[PDB]
Amino acid sequence: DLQDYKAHVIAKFDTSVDLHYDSPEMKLLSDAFKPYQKTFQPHTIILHGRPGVGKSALARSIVLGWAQGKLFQKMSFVIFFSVREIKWTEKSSLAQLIAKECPDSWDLVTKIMSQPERLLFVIDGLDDMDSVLQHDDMTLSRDWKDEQPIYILMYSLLRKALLPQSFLIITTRNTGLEKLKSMVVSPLYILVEGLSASRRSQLVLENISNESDRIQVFHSLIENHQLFDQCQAPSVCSLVCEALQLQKKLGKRCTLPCQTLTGLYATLVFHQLTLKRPSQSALSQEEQITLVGLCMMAAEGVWTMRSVFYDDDLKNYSLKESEILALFHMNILLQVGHNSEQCYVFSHLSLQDFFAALYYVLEGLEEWNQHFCFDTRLLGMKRFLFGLMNKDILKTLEVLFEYPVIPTVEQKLQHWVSLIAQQVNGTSPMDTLDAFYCLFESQDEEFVGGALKRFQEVWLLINQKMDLKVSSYCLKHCQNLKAIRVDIRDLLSVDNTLELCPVVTVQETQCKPLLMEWWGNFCSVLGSLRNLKELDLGDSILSQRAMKILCLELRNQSCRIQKLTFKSAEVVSGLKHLWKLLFSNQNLKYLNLGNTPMKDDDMKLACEALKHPKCSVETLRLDSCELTIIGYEMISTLLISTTRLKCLSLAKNRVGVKSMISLGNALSSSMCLLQKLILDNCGLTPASCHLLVSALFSNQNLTHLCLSNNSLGTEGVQQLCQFLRNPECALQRLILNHCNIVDDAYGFLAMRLANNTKLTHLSLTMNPVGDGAMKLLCEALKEPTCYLQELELVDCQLTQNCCEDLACMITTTKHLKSLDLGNNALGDKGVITLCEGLKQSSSSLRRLGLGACKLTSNCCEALSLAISCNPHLNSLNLVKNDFSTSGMLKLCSAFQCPVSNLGIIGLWKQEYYARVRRQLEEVEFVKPHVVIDGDWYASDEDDRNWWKN
Amino acid sequence: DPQPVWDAEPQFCQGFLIQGLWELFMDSRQKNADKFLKPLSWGSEVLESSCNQPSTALWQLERFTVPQALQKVRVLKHQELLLVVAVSSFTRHVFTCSQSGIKVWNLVNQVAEDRDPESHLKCSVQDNKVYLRTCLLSSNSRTLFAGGYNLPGVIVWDLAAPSLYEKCQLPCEGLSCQALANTKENMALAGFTDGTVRIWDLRTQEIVRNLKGPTNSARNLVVKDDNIWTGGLDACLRCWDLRMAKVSLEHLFQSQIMSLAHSPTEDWLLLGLANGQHCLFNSRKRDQVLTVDTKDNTILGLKFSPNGKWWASVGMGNFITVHSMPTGAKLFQVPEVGPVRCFDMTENGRLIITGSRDCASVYHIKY
Amino acid sequence: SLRLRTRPWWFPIQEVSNPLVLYMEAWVAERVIGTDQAEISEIEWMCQALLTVDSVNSGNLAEITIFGQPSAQTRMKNILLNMAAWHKE
C-alpha cells in the first residue's frame, strides 16, 4: 500500500512545474547524507537562511523527488511535518500525527518494525516553537503511542530520544537557531541564499526614477547592507521595486524619502490606505481601532517571539480578516491552514516589524484599551522605529488620525543617543557607528540635530562605504565637536581599482570611483566644521590619492584644525601633498610626524616649507624617523633660520658625533629661539652629552629639556650643573628619567638646588639614588632659598631610612607642592613616620603619590588620621597596595570627613568586597567633586606630560 | 563571612535601549550619568585607550607589558560545578567542562549573561555512569581531549571539520585521567591516578610508552622539548627523559604540589604548593628552588603570561591574584564568591576566563 | 534564485549577515581558485573566512563573496589578489 501513498503525496504536493530540476544544489542535498569522512556519516541536516528565501519550497521538492524518484531511493519512507499549520497544545501522539498525514493506518505497524533504520523526517518551520519551551524541564519521550502535547514529542525526536538512528532534515530561520543548536546532536548546517548580488542590482536599477538623482539614491540603496541583505527574498525585492515605481508615478504628491526601507514601506502602506477613501478624509473610528489592534498584535508577537497568530489572538484584539482586507486591499495577514483551526501570518516578517514599530507612535493618541478584550530579533523593529520619526510620515499620520501626533518615545531615543556621548573614559566606536546608522534612517534635521549636541569627541572605524556616508551625514550636526579620530585600515590602501559591476556600465560617463568621491565628501565635511581643532588619522593606511584629496580639502579657508597626528598611519606616499598644506593653512600649529621615515628630499621640502613666512607650526614631533647626516644638517640650518617653531622632539633616533656638533653649533647661536627640546632614547654618549651641554652653556632661550633614557657621566652632570649655575639660564623643567646618576653627582645637584630660583620641576625617575643622597636632597630642599615645585622619585632605591627626613622636609618646606614616590619600599613603619609629619599640615603640599609602596592594613589608622585633618592635600595615589576590609573601611571613613578636600583618589575599586564598595559609593555621593579612578597619571592639571606626547 | 554582592555588571547601551522599549510596552497595556562598559567587539578586542605611565619604556622594551586591572564583561551560565575552562582565542570559542559534559560557547554573541551554548557534548548515555574530570585544547585549536573516571579511554574531538564529531578513543580501560598534555611531535600523553603516564601516537592511536611512578604522583604534568615534569601529593617533583625513559631529577618539597606551570620564553618553572607558597625552579641549571610568596589558602591554578613577564593565581581564598614575574610581587586582586577552581588566558593576552561555582566569568585585561 | 552552501559549525551565524563582494575576470577566477576543494577549505580555516565564487554571468566576470569579520575579509582578499596578480603574470 506504499505506492498508493506515494501517488497521493505526489497529488498533494504539485504546485511547481518549471521549478523542479536535477540542479547541482539538489545533488549537494542528496550527497550530503553520505559519509564525507569515512568514519562520520551525519544524521541531521539543518537548513537555515533569511525568512523570505525558498526553503519551504525546497523541502516540498525534496518530498516530491522522493515520491517520484531520482532523488532518494535508500530511504524507504519519508514523512513531512509542517509545524506552522497545526495547533500544538493538545495532547496527541506520533502515531496519530502520522495517521493524519498517512490516510491508511495498517502500514505503520509493519513500517515501525524494521524501518527506523531507513526513515526520513522533513520538518518545516520549527521557528515558532521557540516560545513554548518553559526552559525549566521537559519529560523526554522514549516511545510513541503516548498522550502528550506535540511539542514534547518534537523535542524528543529532535534529541534522538524518541526514534533514534533516523535521518532528519530541518528547515529553520537564522534567528530561530539560538535555542536549537544546543538541542541537536552533531548537525550539518546548510545555508540557503536568495538571488545574487548582480541580479539584485539590476532589479533595483530598472525601477529607479531617473529624475537627475539616479546615482546618489541608487548607491544609497545598494550599499546599505541592512536593506540589500533582506532584499535577497524575491518578495522583498518586489516590494522595494513597487515602492520605487509608485514614488515615480506620484512624483509631486509624495514627500516621503526614498533612501531607506522605512520611507518605501510608509509609501506603500499609506498609498494603499488612501486608495480606499473616495475623497481625502480621516479614517473612521472603527478603522482606527482595527489598525491600532493590528499594530499592537504585531508588537506583542515581536516581543513574545511568535509569528502564527491563532484565531483566539484575533478575537483578543477584536480583529477580523474581513475588515483588514476591506481596509487595506493588500496581501497582508495571509491565512494558512487546512483543518478546522485557522492560522494568520504576515506576508513577510518585515511588515510585522514595521507594524510593531508603528504601534509605538499611535499608542498615545487616545485611550485604545477600552476597545480590546484582553537582541537580534529586535534589530528590524528598532531600525523602523528610528525611521518612523521623520516629520513627513508624522504629517501623514496627523492627516489620517485627525489629531496631532507627538510620540513619547522620541525623548527616549534622543536621551539614549545622548547617553553615548557623555562617557567617562572615551566613547566606544561601535556604539557611535550604531547610533549614526540609526540616525541616518530618520532623515530629519531637527531630530538628528537635537540628538547630537553633547559629543565633543568622536572615534570612528570605517570599513564600508556606507560608514563613510552615514558619518558624513551625521557629522554636519555635531556642532560641539572638538576632536575626532578615524581608523580606516584597508578601505583606501590601494591606489587604483577599476572595475564595473554589471555587464555594462551603470552610467555612460563616470570618470571617478564612488569610493573616492564619498571620501572627498567626508573630507570636505571635516574641513567645514567650526569648533573642531584636532584630527587623528589613527591606524589608517592611505594611498597617494587619498592623501592628496585629504590635504586639498584641508587647505580650505574654513578649516580651523590646530593639531594633526600621523603617529600611527602609513602616509609616506603622499607626503609631498602634506608639505603643500603646511604653508597654506595658517591655523595649524602642531604636527606629529612620528614613525614615518624621511628620505633626503622629503626632509628638504619639509624644512623649506617650515621656513615659509606663511607657516605657523610651533610644535614638531619627529620621533622614530630615521634621519641621516644631511637630515641633521638641514634640521640645524632650519633651527638657525627664521622660524616660528618653539618645541622640537627628536626621540628614538641615533645622533652621531658630526650631527651632534652641527646641532650644537646651531643651538649655541643667539638667534636660535627654541623653548623645549626632547632628546630621550637617543644614543648620546658621555662625549656627546658633554659637547651638547658645552654648546648649551651660552643659550638663554631654552626653558624645557628632556634627556631621559640616555647615558650621562658624572662629568656630564657637572657640566649640566655649571650650565645651571650662571645667570640668564631660563631653564625651568629638567627630565633625567633614566640617565645613570650616581654618588657625587647628586651632591652637585643639591649644591645647585640649595640656592637657585627659576627651576621649578625636576624628575629623577629610575635612578639609583638611595637614602644617602636623600639626606642631601632633603637638606637642599629645606633651605628657604629653593623654589622647586615638583619632585618625582618614582623608581629610586628608597627605603624607610630616609622617611623621617622626608617628614621634616614636608614640615619645613614652603615652595614644594608635588612629590611622587612611585616604586619605593617604605613599608608600614616608613609610612607611619612620614604621616607623622604629614598630618600637622605645616606646608602646602598638594599632590602625594604612594602607589606600589608595600602598604599593609597596619598603617591605615595613621593615614586616616593624617588625611582626616589636612585640608591642603588635593591628590593622592594608593594603587598596588594590599588593604584588608577593616583598614580600607577606616580609609573610607576618613575620606567622608567634612574637613578633607580631596579631589583625585587613585584606586581600582573592583578589588574589594561589597561593604567597601558601598562605602566608596557613599563617599562619591557625599562629595560630588571626588573622582575615584585607577588611572592616576591621566590627571594633568599643569603641563606635566609635555615630553611624552 | 564577607559576602560579595553580585550585580548585573555590563548594562551595555544596546541593552539599555532594549530595556527602555520593553517597559513602555507594558506601561501602555495596564488600564485595560549612567555607566556603560565597552563591548567585546567581534569577540576579539575592546577598543579602549591604554593607561598612562610615569615614564617612557626603553627602545628594546616594547612588547613586555604588565596588566593593571581586570574588568568583568560576561558570565557564562553552566548549570553544574565547573571543573575546567579553555579558550583558544584563534577561533573565539570557550570550552567549559563539568562532571557531566562539555559546553562550547562563542564569544561573538553580545549578551550580558549567556545561557545558550553553541554545543553540549556529553558521554553519560554511552555507559552506566561515567564522570568527566579534565579537558585539554591543542595549540593550533584543531583538537579537543577529554578524560574522566569510568571512561574506556580519553575522547578526542575534531574542531576543524564541518561538523563536531568524535574522532579517536585512545584506550585506557581502568584508570582515571587526572591530567592531559600534548606535544608538537603529534603525540598525546596522560597521567592517571595510580602514577602511570601513558603516551599515545595521535595518528595511529598506538601506545608508545608507559611510565610508572608512585600513587598520586602524576596530578600535574608539563611537557617541554624533551623532558616531562611531574608532581603530586607525594610532594616530590621529578623529570623524565623520553629517550632514556627513567627519572632524571628528584626534588623534595615541604608540601604537596598542587599546580605546575612553565614559562613560555625563559627557563623557569612555577610550583604552587598546598600551603599557599609559590616557588620558582630553573629547569636548565636546576640549582635551587626559590620561594616568592606566602598565603593562608591553597593554590589550585597557575598560568604564565604569553610573554612570560607575569602570572596569575587562583585558589580557595575567594581571590584571583596577579603577580609580577621578576621577583613575584603582587600586582592586584579581584574577589569572587567561592573557591575558584579553574581559569584560562587567551593567546594574545587580552581575556581571562574564571570558573568559580557554576558560572564562568570572563574578564578583560586592562594594560 | 537559489544557492546552497555548507556552513562549518565553527563559523558564527552573526558573521553571515554582512559579506564583501568583488568582481574579477572569469579566466583568472577558475585558474586561481582551481578545482580542488581541500586546499580551499584549508585556506578558509586559516583565514577564518568563507568564500564563494559565482560565474553565472554571461560576460567574462566572476563574483567572489567573502564572509567574516573585517580583518578576516581583508586578509582573504589580499591572499586572493596576490595569487591572482602572480597568476596573471
From Swiss-Prot, chain A:
Domain NACHT: start-end pairs: 43-365
Disulfide bond among keywords: no
Induction cue: (Microbial infection) Reduced by T.gondii in the testes and uterus.
Main location: cytoplasm
Superkingdom, taxonomy of origin: Eukaryota
Effect of residue 515 to R: Decreased interaction with TLE6
Effect of residue 383 to C: Impaired formation of the subcortical maternal complex (SCMC)
Gene Ontology MF annotations: ATP binding; structural constituent of cytoplasmic lattice
LRR repeats: 587-608, 616-637, 644-664, 673-692, 701-721, 730-750, 758-779, 787-808, 815-836, 844-865, 872-893
GO cellular component entries: apical cortex; cell cortex; cortical granule; cytoplasm; cytoplasmic lattice; cytosol; Golgi apparatus; mitochondrion
Mutagenesis or variant effect for residue 388 to R: Impaired formation of the subcortical maternal complex (SCMC)
Impact reported for residue 225 to C: Impaired formation of the subcortical maternal complex (SCMC)
Keyword Repeat: yes
Subcellular location: Cytoplasm; Cytoplasmic vesicle, Secretory vesicle, Cortical granule; Mitochondrion; Nucleus, Nucleolus
Processing after translation: Phosphorylated by PRKCE.
Gene Ontology BP term (one): establishment of spindle localization
Record annotation: effect of changing residue 83 to G: In strain: A/J
UniProt KW keywords: ATP-binding, Cytoplasm, Cytoplasmic vesicle, Golgi apparatus, Leucine-rich repeat, Mitochondrion, Nucleotide-binding, Nucleus, Repeat
Subunit organization: Component of the subcortical maternal complex (SCMC), at least composed of NLRP5, KHDC3, OOEP, and TLE6. Within the complex, interacts with OOEP, KHDC3 and TLE6. The SCMC may facilitate translocation of its components between the nuclear and cytoplasmic compartments. As part of the SCMC interacts with the SCMC-associated protein ZBED3. As part of the SCMC interacts with the SCMC-associated protein CFL1/Cofilin-1. Interacts with PRKCE. Interacts with TUBB3 at cytoskeleton microtubules.
Family according to the record: Belongs to the NLRP family.
Record's protein name: NACHT, LRR and PYD domains-containing protein 5
Species of provenance: Mus musculus (Mouse)
Gene: Nlrp5
Part of the full-length chain shown: 201 to 1163 of 1163
Swiss-Prot record, chain B:
GO cellular component: cell cortex; cytoplasmic lattice; cytosol; nucleus; protein-containing complex; sperm midpiece; subcortical maternal complex
Record note on disruption phenotype: Females show normal ovarian histology, ovulation and egg morphology, however fail to produce offspring following successful mating. Progression from one- to two-cell embryos is delayed by 4-6 hours and embryos failed to develop into morulae and blastocysts. Embryos form unequal sized blastomeres due to smaller, dysmorphic, and displaced mitotic spindles resulting to asymmetric division.
Induction field: Induced by E2A-HLF, a chimeric transcription factor containing the transactivation domain of E2A linked to the DNA-binding and dimerization domain of HLF. Induced during TNFSF11/RANKL-induced osteoclast differentiation.
Domain of life (superkingdom): Eukaryota
Signal sequence extent: none
Effect of residue 151 to P: Impaired formation of the subcortical maternal complex (SCMC)
Tissues and organs where the protein is expressed, per its UniProt entry: Expressed in spermatogonia (at protein level). Expressed predominantly in ovaries, where it is restricted to growing oocytes, with greatest levels in fully grown oocytes. Expressed predominantly in testis, heart, lung, liver and muscle, and at very low levels in the brain, spleen and kidney. Expressed in bone marrow-derived macrophages and osteoclasts.
Modified residues (Phosphoserine): 305
Keyword terms, alphabetized: Cytoplasm, Nucleus, Phosphoprotein, Repeat, Transcription, Transcription regulation, WD repeat
GO MF term list: structural constituent of cytoplasmic lattice
Entry's Gene Ontology BP terms: actin filament organization; endoplasmic reticulum localization; epigenetic programming in the zygotic pronuclei; establishment of spindle localization; flagellated sperm motility; mitochondrion localization; negative regulation of transcription by RNA polymerase II; positive regulation of embryonic development
Places the protein is found: Cytoplasm; Nucleus
Repeat is among the record's keywords: yes
Entire-sequence positions represented here: 146 to 581 of 581
UniProtKB/Swiss-Prot annotation, chain C:
Tissue-by-tissue expression: Expressed in ovaries, where it is restricted to growing oocytes, with greatest levels in fully grown oocytes.
Keyword match Transmembrane helix: no
Compartments in which it is found: Cytoplasm; Nucleus
Deletion phenotype: Embryonic death at 2.5 dpc. Progression from embryonic 1- to 2-cell stage delayed 6-8 hours. Less than 20% of the embryos progress beyond 2-cell stage. Embryos form unequal sized blastomeres due to smaller, dysmorphic, and displaced mitotic spindles resulting in asymmetric division. Decrease in thickness of subcortical F-actin in zygotes, thickening of F-actin bundles in the cytoplasm and loss of F-actin cytoplasmic lattices. Decrease in CFL1/Cofilin-1 expression in the subcortex and diffused distribution in the cytoplasm of zygotes.
MF terms in GO: RNA binding; structural constituent of cytoplasmic lattice
Keyword annotations from UniProtKB, A to Z: Cytoplasm, Nucleus
Sequence ranges assigned to domain KH in this UniProt record: 19-80
GO cellular component: apical part of cell; cell cortex; cytoplasmic lattice; nucleus; protein-containing complex; subcortical maternal complex
Biological process (GO), any one: regulation of establishment of protein localization
KW Nucleus (keyword) present: yes
Expression induction: Induced by etoposide.
Family: Belongs to the KHDC1 family.
Self-association state and partner proteins as the record states: Component of the subcortical maternal complex (SCMC), at least composed of NLRP5, KHDC3, OOEP, and TLE6. Within the complex, interacts with NLRP5, KHDC3 and TLE6. The SCMC may facilitate translocation of its components between the nuclear and cytoplasmic compartments. As part of the SCMC interacts with the SCMC-associated protein NLRP4F. Forms a scaffold complex with KHDC3/FILIA, and interacts with BLM and TRIM25 at DNA replication forks.
Domain remark in the UniProt entry: Contains an atypical KH domain with amino acid changes at critical sites, suggesting that it may not bind RNA.
Protein's name according to its UniProt entry: Oocyte-expressed protein homolog
Organism: Mus musculus (Mouse)
Originating gene: Ooep
Whole-protein residues included: 26 to 114 of 164
